[PDB]
């Protein structure tokens, strides 16, 4: 489009971000499709642990303050889930850190109790890994699926 | 509405209704300037 009125329209009305939900049923038509879904089930798994070097790399790898991805002008990082013997970060903590740097600082963290496509039986005895739990913008239970 | 000549030449009614019509092919829809076409390729880095 060759004028500012047509620009404003393509940036605020017909733009992609304003088309997350279809008007047919009010359901989402935007999301990740294949590798990302399989990657998430592995990354958010209990068995997935990360060192300070690994953890910080995964953060800056997807969040770049120079590209305006941050909301705090400094990459904030959570303390490790394992202090002694070796300092280690869980996979779920990367998901907590990504939200902590992309959601506004003025607003409180997200609170959601959702479910997974993968049943608890697959993750062994007494696991609650089907229950997706977000308390004050922190992934505390459950893996992340296509769901 | 004219007699058969030994496909006839189209009239002005035929010009407005050639296929879909002048209204559908050149008013409701139009070929545009400042536009491009290409095969799409996937990209997770954008």
């Amino acid at each position: 489009p060759q004028n500012e009125n047509a620009r404003a329209e393509a940036l605020n009305l017909a733009n992609t971000d304003s088309q997350y939900l279809t008007p047919t049923s009010g359901s989402p038509v935007r999301g990740l499709i294949q590798d990302h879904i399989s990657a998430g089930v592995w990354l958010t798994s209990k068995d997935s642990f990360f060192t300070r070097e690994q953890y910080q790399q995964y953060i800056y790898g997807c969040i770049r303050p120079e590209d305006g991805h941050t909301t705090r002008s400094k990459i904030v990082t959570l303390p490790p889930t394992i202090f002694k013997p070796y300092p280690l970060w869980t996979g779920k903590q990367i998901i907590t850190t990504v939200l902590l740097n992309v959601t506004p600082p003025d607003m409180p963290g997200i609170n959601l109790i959702s479910k997974n496509k993968i049943k608890n039986e697959y993750w062994g005895k007494g696991s609650l890994e089907n229950e997706v739990l977000f308390k004050d913008g922190a992934l505390l239970c459950g893996i992340l699926d296509k769901s | 509405k004219a007699q058969g000549r030994t496909v006839p030449i189209p009239g002005v009614k035929q010009a407005l209704e050639k296929k879909e019509g002048l209204f559908r092919k050149h008013m409701m829809g139009k070929r545009v300037n400042y536009a491009a076409r290409s095969v799409i390729s996937p990209d997770p880095n954008i």
Binding site: D47, P79, I82, F83, K84, Y122, G124, A138 | -
Partner: protein, 134 residues
């Protein structure tokens, strides 16, 4: 300061299709009604069946801005125990009369302590350190 301290006897160590984590089922040696269900990184701190673990819940280590990697001459409460985890309390459940069960999460690594007297000390705090000995 400390919020909870007890010595537990391990009854189960289940991997559950995990190569590094294990679900520990324990019972207190002092209190009869007390029970424990905790996920630990068995790769770093291995736990075997019929073992004595000194599980301790603390608020901090004897106002902090952020976590820093260890640097020469630093003293902590963690220096007394072998395996230390940092997590949050997300659920407070009551089981029949007098008995109360707390739910903790150390980044997916869940813990469920069942007791009665700890209702005052154990509170839903976004900061709770879990320290284990032996």
């Amino acid at each position: 300061n400390t919020l909870f301290d007890d010595i537990f006897q391990v009854s189960e160590v289940d991997p559950g299709r995990y190569n590094k984590v294990c679900r520990i089922e324990a019972a207190s040696t002092t209190q009869d009604q007390c029970k424990l269900t905790l996920d630990i990184n068995v790769e770093l701190f291995p736990v075997a069946a019929q073992d004595s673990l000194t599980v301790t819940i603390a608020s901090s280590l004897n106002a902090t801005r952020s976590w820093r990697p260890p640097q020469a001459g630093d003293r902590s409460l963690a220096d007394d125990y072998d395996y230390v985890m940092y997590g949050t309390a997300y659920k407070f459940e009551e089981v029949s009369k007098d008995l109360i069960a707390v739910y903790y999460s150390f980044g997916g690594l869940l813990m469920r302590l069942e007791g009665n007297y700890r209702n005052l000390n154990n509170l839903k705090q976004e900061n709770a350190y879990l320290l284990i000995r032996r």
